């Protein structure tokens, strides 16, 4: 009789190697203090 290849158990001669891509990353703007904060840290503003 004939039979499908799926009827025969499969052994692999291939060596596996799983490489995955480094995914995209988004860098948002990020400051510890803005210019507004730096200017506001003064106690008196001469101009105002």
């Amino acid at each position: 009789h004939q039979l499908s290849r799926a009827d025969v158990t499969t052994v692999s001669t291939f060596i596996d190697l799983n490489i995955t891509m480094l995914e995209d990353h988004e860098f948002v703007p990020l400051e510890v203090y803005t210019r507004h904060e730096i200017k506001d840290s003064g106690l008196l503003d001469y101009t105002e």
Binding site: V32, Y33, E37, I38, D40, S41, L43
Partner: protein, 49 residues
Amino acid sequence: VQFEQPRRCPTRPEGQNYTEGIAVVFKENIAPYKFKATMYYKDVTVSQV
């Protein structure tokens, strides 16, 4: 001469364990304390003419 027998392969390092959490990051406060005040004074002018 003879062939070298299979070497012991490296292993994938176990990896880093990460604890999930929620963070609040605080910086040194440089903002002055602000509040409301009221001044009560009198402009006093003496003109010598």
